[PDB]
Structure formats: C-alpha cells, structure tokens
Design a protein around this ligand. Sequence first.
Ligand SMILES: C[As](C)(=O)[O-]
Ligand SMILES: C[As](C)(=O)[O-]
Ligand SMILES: [Mg+2]
Ligand SMILES: [Mg+2]
Ligand code: NA
Ligand code: NA
Ligand SMILES: [Zn+2]
Ligand SMILES: [Zn+2]
Ligand SMILES: [Zn+2]
Ligand SMILES: [Zn+2]
Lengths: 74, 74
Amino acid sequence: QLTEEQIAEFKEAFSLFDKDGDGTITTKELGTVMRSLGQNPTEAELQDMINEVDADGNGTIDFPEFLTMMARKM
Amino acid sequence: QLTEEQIAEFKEAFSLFDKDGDGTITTKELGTVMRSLGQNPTEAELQDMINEVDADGNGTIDFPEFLTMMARKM
Ligand SMILES: C[As](C)(=O)[O-]
Ligand SMILES: C[As](C)(=O)[O-]
Ligand SMILES: [Mg+2]
Ligand SMILES: [Mg+2]
Ligand code: NA
Ligand code: NA
Ligand SMILES: [Zn+2]
Ligand SMILES: [Zn+2]
Ligand SMILES: [Zn+2]
Ligand SMILES: [Zn+2]
C-alpha cells in the first residue's frame, strides 16, 4: 500500500507540471514528473507508462490514473 | 474581413483564460472571454457558439476554431 507521504509527493510532483491546475498534464511531461521524483525511467519504460495512463490516446494524463500506475510500479 | 486589430484583440482576450498557454480554453470560460471583449451574449447565444466551436464535444475550445466563429459572427 502507498503511504500518505508517497501520495502527497506523487501529487506535488505531478502538480509542478499542471500549469492550469486542473489535475491533468501532457504525456510529454510524464518523464519530467518522474525525474522530479528522483527517478530515471528509460524511453521504453515511459512508453509503457504512457500506454497505461493515457488509456484513451489523447496525450493527456490525469492524477488518478497517474497515481494508480505509480501504485502498481511500487 | 477581420482586421489585424480585431484578430489581435480576439487573441488577447482568449489568452487571458488560457492559463497553461497551449492555445485552448474550456467551454465554461467562453462566456467570460466574450464579456472580456465587451460583449454580452445570452445563454442561448453561448450555447450556439459552444455548438460551433466545440465540434467534438470535449469541453475544450482552441483559438483557430474560436477565431473563425468570431469571423462568422462579425
Ligand atoms: C494537459 As491539459 C488537459 O491541462 O491541456
Ligand atoms: C482548456 As485545457 C485543454 O488547456 O485543459
Ligand atoms: Mg488521456
Ligand atoms: Mg473541443
Ligand atoms: Na493541466
Ligand atoms: Na489552455
Ligand atoms: Zn487544462
Ligand atoms: Zn482519467
Ligand atoms: Zn492545456
Ligand atoms: Zn480545433
């Protein structure tokens, strides 16, 4: 199970790139979010993550989908 | 034909509500954009405008679609 601290940190990093504050970011910024968390995903790993969280193909990731993906990863 | 001044003013008003600067706003803010231009559309007029510019139903209006709608209106 994710801890409160992890959820908070996932949220904070995500929100750094949510410039309009509506809880969504671009798939192009997912790598930046991950590196903001101190991680270093490969291009392949990011593509697999993008396939998971951008379920509908529109290039937009919302926080709830990001978080559950992060939970699976951990 | 729209003048340069009108295009510039349409762009500036639109961009007031493009908080992440990617050239799109929400349909919920279209009325605010119109009032920023000194206009006062009715609810019916806004709904007709929303039908025009949010052609795909996703609640997101981009500048090119806004501008051509504004051109038709004028
Ligand atoms: C990433 As978005 C839906 O706030 O343009
Ligand atoms: C109105 As938008 C696509 O920048 O969230
Ligand atoms: Mg998506
Ligand atoms: Mg749309
Ligand atoms: Na956003
Ligand atoms: Na925007
Ligand atoms: Zn947004
Ligand atoms: Zn979602
Ligand atoms: Zn945006
Ligand atoms: Zn468009």
